[PDB]
């Protein structure tokens with residue numbers, strides 16, 4: 001039932017005129033275009049499809065579907081006599097190549113006069129949906145007389161010439177419904193694990209992790225980010241999902257760590273330049289998770305940073321751990337409403353103690369960090385957010401929730417600094433315990449170290465668990481030998497002031513750990529422990545891979561099979577000095593003479609100019625590699641607040657080992 005349909009069009013910098021097939025068939029004020037297309041070597045800006053007034057003097061009368069070589073997709077809708085110049089677009093909307101082949105993107109653009117709405121979907125993902133006061137039907141642009149593929153005809157000349165191919169293009173004289181859109185067959189090279197409108201109700205995701213458990217279950221954790229893609233301060237929860245079939249399907253997400261001071265709301269965070277720094281500023285949050293499995297207990301263990309209400313990296317108190325040390329014991333300090341200082345601590349059995357009178361009060365803190373008085377739950381009122389008034393407002397919403405010491409409205413509040421929490425699961429990610437704060441590791445006058453997102457390390461020959469953390473001047477490895485019950489630190493100095501030194505570890509051979517880490521120098525650095533993490537070498541650098549000056553998280557595994565008869569390490573990282581893009585897997589072979597690594601093969605995840613930021617990698621039970629990664633430039637200010645860009649792909653070793 002499409003009014004029009006064609007395919008196998010090659011776009012070789014030369015437009016194709018389809019006026020006579022299509023213009024008499026455009027009818028009514030609602031259209032849907034479906035286009036299956038490849039573009040592995042796009043020009044930097046190019047039109048896929050144009051409808052225009054091609055006459056002299058009317059060069060601003062046209063509709064276009066366009067793309068950029070950054071993977072942005074968009075439309076223009078312009079009519080100079082109506083005074084309308086609409087431009088809707090979204091960065092990071094496309095695939096270029098996957099496993100050495102051009103990906104067939106499936107684009108669906110709906111121009112709906114009844115709802116006065118334009119909506120674009122690419123690869124089954126809605127990338128923008130905009131309602132306007134004055135609707136411009138694409139067939140009502142004054143004086144339209146050309147339909148073009150691979151350019152726009154303006155005043156009789158080609159503009160926005162494209163390189164690529166349109167395998168299939170269909171047009172309907174209807175705005176097809178959301179549900180109809182979901183039945184169009186896709187040829188996606190990826191899938192989604194977490195996604196907008198799923199059970200987390202977060203419209204944004206960042207910071208993916210992956211870990212293959214001994215049962216063969218693959219577990220994933222992620223920041224479910226509510227206030228757009230911003231780091232804390234914000235509302236962010238830690239959500240998890242697992243796959244029992246080698247990553248073919250994933251479970252509905254659950255929370256590993258969550259706060260209820262603010263509602264879980266699916267919000268379209270504004271992307272206009274004036275409002276995109278809107279940031280939820282009154283919520284507690286979690287940020288940056290890391291997962292490991294314990295062979296001893298069989299438990300799965302998840303750590304994350306915890307931010308009290310309104311706190312994030314740049315306002316956290318850098319000179320307070322938030323605990324009071326009492327002879328080898330650390331007690332969580334509290335400040336009561338109205339006091340100017342912290343006159344309280346939480347003792348054994350959650351008893352809240354007045355440090356001034358050395359006497360217990362009638363308040364206790366339960367296992368959820370909620371405030372009890374004489375055994376009874378105190379509540380606060382929950383907040384929601386809205387942009388109804390034109391800017392961000394955070395406001396009480398009439399619902400009551402348990403009063404928590406991390407919350408803005410609590411009677412008793414923790415130190416405004418960052419913490420590290422842990423949770424565990426006894427059933428491999430089907431549910432999670434209530435979180436517990438880890439102790440402070442660097443004394444009373446030092447904020448928490450920052451958890452390195454991704455995987456912890458479980459040593460092959462012992463029961464030792466290691467989580468990498470970073471702080472100013474050092475990596476701080478957190479080490480447990482009793483299933484997470486107690487912890488010590490091993491500090492390893494690094495020659496950096498204030499670096500975001502995100503680090504991931506591989507066990508090269510028994511008791512030998514190599515840690516790769518992000519720096520401020522444009523190179524990925526590494527250091528080595530030969531005593532299962534007790535002590536660490538000086539720092540060296542990998543030449544051969546580039547990052548930007550500010551750096552990006554790198555994920556790393558030791559592969560279980562030999563490759564070219566040698567043991568192998570796989571790294572995942574952008575490889576570019578310009579931005580977070582040019583994503584690669586790099587396969588290094590270990591030289592058994594000295595534990596040095598020859599980086600030998602680099603696989604491009606997609607085009608050098610397409611987004612690739614934080615990433616997670618794991619060897620699947622069947623020896624494929626699972627990659628869950630941010631497919632966008634998560635540093636760029638133009639790419640903030642994008643939905644469904646954290647995506648999962650499956651690769652085999654033979655995919656990686658061309659080329660050298």
Ligand SMILES: O=C(NCc1cccc(F)c1Cl)[C@H]1C[C@@H](O)[C@@H](O)C1
Nearest residue numbers: 211212557560618619620621622623
């Ligand atoms: O058990 C690990 N690697 C071994 C492994 C994974 C998949 C298939 C295998 F045959 C093996 Cl040995 C750890 C699991 C975590 O995800 C770490 O990346 C490596």
